[PDB]
Amino acid sequence: SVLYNFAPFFAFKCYGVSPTKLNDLCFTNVYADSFVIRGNEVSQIAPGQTGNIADYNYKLPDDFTGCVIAWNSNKLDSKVGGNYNYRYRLFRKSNLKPFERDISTEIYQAGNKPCNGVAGVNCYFPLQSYGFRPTYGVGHQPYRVVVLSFELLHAPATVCGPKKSTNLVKNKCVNFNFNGLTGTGVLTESNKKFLPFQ
């Protein structure tokens, strides 16, 4: 129920199990990654689609068992001055495989001269700060992006959906369902005595 609020979603249509059917199926483990990207790079992350910001950063493959949910929110995400905390990799060594990461504070070369402490014209930095400012356009705005991944058929399932509960009933036989025990019969007060593990 906390997945249908907290600002309108920029992209809630899913590419796998439906987001309305999370209650209907119980999962083993759920994986979430939290980062903010520019508004022009939201279209880059997609099943079977990549560009410059998508290939050199985390990539979402065609098969994911999950999808992406993003929303627009500017409360502590955009700065009127500078925003150097949020950086993107735009000059990488090679393609970045999915479910992998790499961090480097050292300059990235682009030719034959090995730059490992000296810079110049042919050597640049692989990192660059985001242009997150409210004075810019809509596509330059920061967007809170989270991706949900589900792991199935590898472990016992414990992340189950919220199964609702109803009110009491007495002396009138219904089609009850007590923790998976489905049956039909009256509900009367029991004179028996159980044990706490029973």
Partner: antibody, heavy 126, light 109 residues
Framework: VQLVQSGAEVKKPGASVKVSCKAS????????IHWVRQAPGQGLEWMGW????????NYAQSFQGRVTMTRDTSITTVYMELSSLRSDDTAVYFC????????????????????WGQGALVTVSS | PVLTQPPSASGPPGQSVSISCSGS????????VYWYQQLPGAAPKLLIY???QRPSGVPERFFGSKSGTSASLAISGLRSEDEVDYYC???????????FGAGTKVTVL
């Protein structure tokens, strides 16, 4: 912006002083405040930034307990405490204003001191 | 990894001259190098940021560039009103703090 400095007296070693720079004239949740000390006979020294919305700081390998950096969002005024003043600590504490949040370590490469305002003169003697 | 700057500068007016600001290995080049100045008895300002473009409000006389460990400040013509105290600013990842040069004093010959 109102980057004025509050006056401080000369105190002998064995106590601590308070150096305050006014942070009004701009929003306190988006602009960073940096402090640089200029001492004659050597280069400038730089000890840490502040994040004026929460608790976040980074120290260099020059001072660990002499410099305490605080913040106040209700009054929009930062207060700095310097203890055990000496010839090494005798420097012009400059109040610098820079844009950017920079609560991490890889963001300070892209920062630069936009405006320097009303560097306080601090001295010390018995 | 301390920045190396001469204590005094010998700049003759009428011709160009280059001055150097060098650090050490993994000190200059991995991070951008800035040029800063301060008026005597006044708050400092910035001369050249990132050694790429000249900021607005400053005349285009000082040329900023980096050549490996050595950072060069190229000038074209010397004026009597441009005798501000020059300084070198850089960032190093081995200290997590800004390292500044010794400071170069420009005196007219």
């Amino acid at each position: 912006v109102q980057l004025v400095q509050s006056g401080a007296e000369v105190k002998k070693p064995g106590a601590s002083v308070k150096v305050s720079c006014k942070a009004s004239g701009y929003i306190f949740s988006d602009y960073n405040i940096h402090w640089v000390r200029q001492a004659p006979g050597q280069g400038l020294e730089w000890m840490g930034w502040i994040s004026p919305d929460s608790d976040d700081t980074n120290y260099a390998q020059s001072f660990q307990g002499r410099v305490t950096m605080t913040r106040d969002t209700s009054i929009t005024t930062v207060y700095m405490e310097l203890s055990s003043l000496r010839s090494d600590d005798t420097a012009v504490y400059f109040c610098a204003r820079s844009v950017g949040y920079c609560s991490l370590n890889s963001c300070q490469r892209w920062m630069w001191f936009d405006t320097w305002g009303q560097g306080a003169l601090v001295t010390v003697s018995s | 990894p301390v920045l190396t700057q001469p204590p005094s500068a010998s700049g003759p007016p009428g011709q160009s001259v280059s001055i150097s600001c060098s650090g050490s290995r993994s000190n200059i080049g991995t991070n951008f190098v800035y040029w800063y100045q301060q008026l005597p008895g006044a708050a400092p300002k910035l001369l050249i940021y990132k050694n790429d473009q000249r900021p607005s409000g400053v005349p285009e006389r000082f040329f900023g560039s980096k050549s490996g460990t050595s950072a060069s400040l190229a000038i074209s013509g010397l004026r009597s009103e441009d005798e501000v105290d020059y300084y070198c600013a850089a960032w190093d990842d081995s200290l997590s703090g800004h390292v500044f040069g010794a400071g170069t004093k420009v005196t007219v010959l």
